[PDB]
Protein backbone atom coordinates (compact mmCIF):
# COMPACT_ATOMS: atom_id res chain seq x y z
CA UNK A 1 0.00 0.00 0.00
CA UNK A 2 0.91 3.69 -0.13
CA UNK A 3 0.92 4.04 3.66
CA UNK A 4 3.84 1.66 4.28
CA UNK A 5 6.09 3.00 1.49
CA UNK A 6 8.57 5.57 2.87
CA UNK A 7 7.78 9.18 1.94
CA UNK A 8 11.09 10.99 2.53
CA UNK A 9 14.48 9.30 2.79
CA UNK A 10 15.60 11.54 5.66
CA UNK A 11 14.78 10.53 9.25
CA UNK A 12 14.01 6.84 8.79
CA UNK A 13 14.03 4.16 11.52
CA UNK A 14 13.48 0.40 11.57
CA UNK A 15 11.74 -2.01 13.91
CA UNK A 16 13.51 -4.87 15.66
CA UNK A 17 10.81 -7.58 15.58
CA UNK A 18 9.79 -7.63 11.91
CA UNK A 19 12.35 -5.02 10.73
CA UNK A 20 9.85 -2.59 9.20
CA UNK A 21 11.70 0.35 7.64
CA UNK A 22 9.60 3.50 7.11
CA UNK A 23 9.73 7.24 7.76
CA UNK A 24 9.43 8.81 11.21
CA UNK A 25 6.20 10.59 10.27
CA UNK A 26 4.59 7.26 9.37
CA UNK A 27 5.87 5.72 12.62
CA UNK A 28 4.30 8.55 14.62
CA UNK A 29 1.03 8.41 12.65
CA UNK A 30 0.70 4.78 11.50
CA UNK A 31 3.38 2.85 13.38
CA UNK A 32 4.28 -0.80 13.10
CA UNK A 33 1.69 -2.47 10.89
CA UNK A 34 2.85 -6.09 11.16
CA UNK A 35 2.76 -5.78 14.97
CA UNK A 36 0.45 -3.16 16.49
CA UNK A 37 -1.79 -4.92 19.03
CA UNK A 38 1.26 -6.53 20.69
CA UNK A 39 3.47 -3.43 20.54
CA UNK A 40 1.18 -0.43 21.17
CA UNK A 41 3.08 1.99 18.95
CA UNK A 42 0.41 4.26 17.42
CA UNK A 43 -0.33 7.53 19.19
CA UNK A 44 3.01 8.44 20.81
CA UNK A 45 6.65 9.17 20.03
CA UNK A 46 8.48 7.95 23.15
CA UNK A 47 7.78 4.27 22.45
CA UNK A 48 9.08 4.75 18.89
CA UNK A 49 12.53 5.73 20.16
CA UNK A 50 12.28 3.11 22.92
CA UNK A 51 11.81 0.06 20.68
CA UNK A 52 12.81 1.16 17.17
CA UNK A 53 16.44 2.11 16.51
CA UNK A 54 18.12 3.93 13.63
CA UNK A 55 21.18 1.64 13.83
CA UNK A 56 20.48 -0.57 10.82
CA UNK A 57 21.77 -1.14 7.29
CA UNK A 58 20.46 -2.85 4.18
CA UNK A 59 17.18 -2.41 2.30
CA UNK A 60 15.08 -5.00 0.46
CA UNK A 61 11.89 -4.53 -1.57
CA UNK A 62 9.75 -7.30 -0.12
CA UNK A 63 6.64 -7.88 -2.24
CA UNK A 64 5.83 -11.63 -2.14
CA UNK A 65 6.99 -13.21 1.14
CA UNK A 66 4.91 -16.34 0.49
CA UNK A 67 7.08 -17.12 -2.58
CA UNK A 68 10.64 -15.90 -1.93
CA UNK A 69 13.85 -17.44 -0.59
CA UNK A 70 14.96 -14.18 1.07
CA UNK A 71 11.78 -14.13 3.18
CA UNK A 72 12.39 -17.72 4.30
CA UNK A 73 16.01 -16.91 5.18
CA UNK A 74 14.94 -13.81 7.13
CA UNK A 75 11.82 -15.51 8.60
CA UNK A 76 9.42 -12.78 7.46
CA UNK A 77 7.00 -14.90 5.43
CA UNK A 78 4.06 -14.28 7.78
CA UNK A 79 4.33 -10.47 7.44
CA UNK A 80 2.75 -7.96 5.08
CA UNK A 81 4.60 -6.61 2.03
CA UNK A 82 6.83 -3.62 2.60
CA UNK A 83 10.37 -2.29 2.79
CA UNK A 84 12.36 -4.33 5.32
CA UNK A 85 16.05 -4.60 6.21
CA UNK A 86 18.59 -7.39 6.65
CA UNK A 87 20.45 -6.33 9.82
CA UNK A 88 19.04 -4.25 12.70
CA UNK A 89 21.44 -3.81 15.61
CA UNK A 90 19.81 -3.41 19.00
CA UNK A 91 17.98 -5.14 21.81
CA UNK A 92 14.79 -4.22 23.64
CA UNK A 93 15.03 -3.40 27.36
CA UNK A 94 14.00 -5.84 30.10
CA UNK A 95 10.57 -4.28 30.59
CA UNK A 96 8.87 -4.87 27.24
CA UNK A 97 10.41 -8.19 26.14
CA UNK A 98 8.92 -10.00 29.14
CA UNK A 99 5.26 -9.48 28.19
CA UNK A 100 5.84 -10.65 24.60
CA UNK A 101 6.47 -14.25 25.68
CA UNK A 102 3.49 -14.18 28.05
CA UNK A 103 1.14 -13.13 25.23
CA UNK A 104 2.50 -15.72 22.79
CA UNK A 105 5.08 -13.68 20.86
CA UNK A 106 8.53 -15.20 20.34
CA UNK A 107 11.27 -12.54 20.49
CA UNK A 108 14.07 -13.35 18.05
CA UNK A 109 17.24 -11.47 17.11
CA UNK A 110 16.92 -10.09 13.57
CA UNK A 111 20.60 -9.00 13.55
CA UNK A 112 21.70 -11.68 11.11
CA UNK A 113 25.00 -9.84 10.61
CA UNK A 114 28.20 -11.14 12.16
CA UNK A 115 30.54 -9.42 14.65
CA UNK A 116 34.24 -9.20 13.75
CA UNK B 1 13.66 -21.44 -6.14
CA UNK B 2 13.78 -17.99 -7.75
CA UNK B 3 16.94 -16.60 -9.33
CA UNK B 4 18.81 -13.38 -8.51
CA UNK B 5 19.81 -11.12 -11.42
CA UNK B 6 22.19 -8.16 -11.58
CA UNK B 7 21.61 -4.79 -13.26
CA UNK B 8 23.98 -1.84 -13.55
CA UNK B 9 23.09 1.59 -12.17
CA UNK B 10 24.62 4.98 -11.45
CA UNK B 11 27.12 5.56 -8.65
CA UNK B 12 25.56 7.18 -5.60
CA UNK B 13 21.89 6.44 -6.41
CA UNK B 14 20.71 3.20 -4.81
CA UNK B 15 18.03 4.16 -2.28
CA UNK B 16 16.42 6.53 -4.78
CA UNK B 17 16.30 3.72 -7.34
CA UNK B 18 14.77 1.39 -4.75
CA UNK B 19 12.05 3.85 -3.73
CA UNK B 20 11.30 4.64 -7.39
CA UNK B 21 10.93 0.92 -8.13
CA UNK B 22 8.66 0.50 -5.10
CA UNK B 23 6.49 3.39 -6.29
CA UNK B 24 6.30 1.94 -9.80
CA UNK B 25 5.32 -1.50 -8.49
CA UNK B 26 2.66 -0.06 -6.19
CA UNK B 27 1.30 2.10 -9.02
CA UNK B 28 1.33 -0.68 -11.64
CA UNK B 29 0.15 -3.69 -9.62
CA UNK B 30 -3.62 -3.56 -10.30
CA UNK B 31 -3.17 -3.11 -14.07
CA UNK B 32 -2.87 -5.41 -17.07
CA UNK B 33 0.96 -5.11 -17.02
CA UNK B 34 2.14 -6.01 -13.51
CA UNK B 35 5.75 -6.53 -12.44
CA UNK B 36 6.86 -10.11 -11.77
CA UNK B 37 9.90 -9.07 -9.72
CA UNK B 38 10.16 -10.66 -6.27
CA UNK B 39 12.64 -8.36 -4.49
CA UNK B 40 15.74 -6.22 -4.99
CA UNK B 41 18.82 -6.05 -2.76
CA UNK B 42 20.71 -2.75 -2.38
CA UNK B 43 23.55 -3.31 0.10
CA UNK B 44 25.04 -0.25 1.75
CA UNK B 45 28.68 -1.32 1.32
CA UNK B 46 28.29 -1.65 -2.46
CA UNK B 47 27.91 1.49 -4.58
CA UNK B 48 27.50 1.35 -8.35
CA UNK B 49 24.92 -1.31 -9.14
CA UNK B 50 21.89 -3.05 -7.64
CA UNK B 51 20.44 -6.56 -7.63
CA UNK B 52 17.05 -7.97 -8.55
CA UNK B 53 15.23 -11.25 -7.91
CA UNK B 54 13.32 -12.97 -10.72
CA UNK B 55 13.10 -16.32 -12.48
CA UNK B 56 13.84 -15.36 -16.10
CA UNK B 57 15.77 -12.48 -17.64
CA UNK B 58 12.78 -11.34 -19.72
CA UNK B 59 10.89 -10.51 -16.52
CA UNK B 60 13.37 -7.91 -15.28
CA UNK B 61 14.08 -6.83 -18.87
CA UNK B 62 10.43 -5.85 -19.40
CA UNK B 63 10.04 -4.63 -15.81
CA UNK B 64 12.72 -1.92 -16.04
CA UNK B 65 11.29 -0.31 -19.20
CA UNK B 66 10.71 3.44 -19.17
CA UNK B 67 12.93 4.24 -16.18
CA UNK B 68 15.67 6.72 -17.04
CA UNK B 69 18.09 5.59 -14.33
CA UNK B 70 18.58 1.93 -15.32
CA UNK B 71 18.93 2.78 -19.03
CA UNK B 72 22.68 2.09 -18.86
CA UNK B 73 22.27 -1.45 -17.54
CA UNK B 74 19.59 -2.49 -20.02
CA UNK B 75 21.46 -4.27 -22.85
CA UNK B 76 23.22 -6.78 -20.55
CA UNK B 77 21.81 -8.97 -17.77
CA UNK B 78 24.41 -11.00 -15.87
CA UNK B 79 23.47 -14.09 -13.87
CA UNK B 80 25.34 -15.06 -10.69
CA UNK B 81 25.71 -18.65 -9.40
CA UNK B 82 23.46 -20.14 -6.75
CA UNK B 83 26.30 -20.08 -4.21
CA UNK B 84 26.18 -16.26 -4.19
CA UNK B 85 22.58 -16.22 -2.90
CA UNK B 86 23.70 -15.84 0.74
CA UNK B 87 26.88 -13.71 0.81
CA UNK B 88 25.12 -10.57 -0.46
CA UNK B 89 23.06 -10.26 2.74
CA UNK B 90 26.14 -10.62 4.97
CA UNK B 91 27.30 -7.46 6.76
CA UNK B 92 30.62 -6.98 8.58
CA UNK B 93 30.73 -4.82 11.71
CA UNK B 94 24.05 0.72 11.70
CA UNK B 95 27.39 1.28 13.46
CA UNK B 96 25.83 3.58 16.07
CA UNK B 97 26.29 2.46 19.68
CA UNK B 98 27.30 4.49 22.75
CA UNK B 99 30.60 3.89 24.54
CA UNK B 100 32.20 2.98 21.19
CA UNK B 101 35.23 4.30 19.32
CA UNK B 102 34.83 6.37 16.15
CA UNK B 103 37.09 8.47 13.93
CA UNK B 104 36.76 11.97 12.48
CA UNK B 105 37.22 13.29 8.94
CA UNK B 106 36.85 17.08 9.09
CA UNK B 107 37.89 19.59 11.74
CA UNK B 108 41.42 19.59 13.15
CA UNK B 109 41.51 16.11 14.72
CA UNK B 110 41.78 14.41 11.34
CA UNK B 111 42.70 10.71 11.21
CA UNK B 112 42.38 10.32 14.98
CA UNK B 113 40.48 7.81 17.11
CA UNK B 114 37.87 9.06 19.59
CA UNK B 115 35.12 7.69 21.85
CA UNK B 116 31.37 8.28 21.96
CA UNK B 117 29.71 9.39 25.21
CA UNK B 118 26.06 10.35 24.61
CA UNK B 119 23.75 10.27 21.59
CA UNK B 120 20.97 12.79 20.94
CA UNK B 121 17.65 11.20 19.87
CA UNK B 122 17.08 14.20 17.56
CA UNK B 123 19.66 12.64 15.18
CA UNK B 124 21.38 15.99 14.58
CA UNK B 125 24.46 16.06 16.84
CA UNK B 126 26.40 13.53 18.91
CA UNK B 127 28.91 13.98 21.72
CA UNK B 128 32.49 12.76 21.46
CA UNK B 129 35.55 12.26 23.66
CA UNK B 130 38.95 13.58 22.58
CA UNK B 131 42.11 15.05 24.10
CA UNK B 132 42.79 18.65 22.99
CA UNK B 133 45.74 19.33 20.71
CA UNK B 134 45.79 23.15 20.69
CA UNK B 135 48.89 25.04 21.83
CA UNK B 136 46.90 27.00 24.47
CA UNK B 137 47.51 30.29 22.60
CA UNK B 138 51.27 30.65 22.99
CA UNK B 139 52.72 30.00 19.53
CA UNK B 140 50.10 31.62 17.29
CA UNK B 141 49.79 35.40 17.00
ZN1 LIG C 1 8.65 -4.97 13.66
PDB file of C-alpha atoms in Angstrom, chain A residues 114-116, chain B residues 91-93:
ATOM      1  CA  UNK A 114      28.204 -11.137  12.164  1.00  0.00           C
ATOM      2  CA  UNK A 115      30.536  -9.421  14.647  1.00  0.00           C
ATOM      3  CA  UNK A 116      34.235  -9.198  13.752  1.00  0.00           C
TER       4      UNK A 116
ATOM      5  CA  UNK B  91      27.301  -7.462   6.763  1.00  0.00           C
ATOM      6  CA  UNK B  92      30.619  -6.982   8.582  1.00  0.00           C
ATOM      7  CA  UNK B  93      30.727  -4.818  11.712  1.00  0.00           C
TER       8      UNK B  93
END
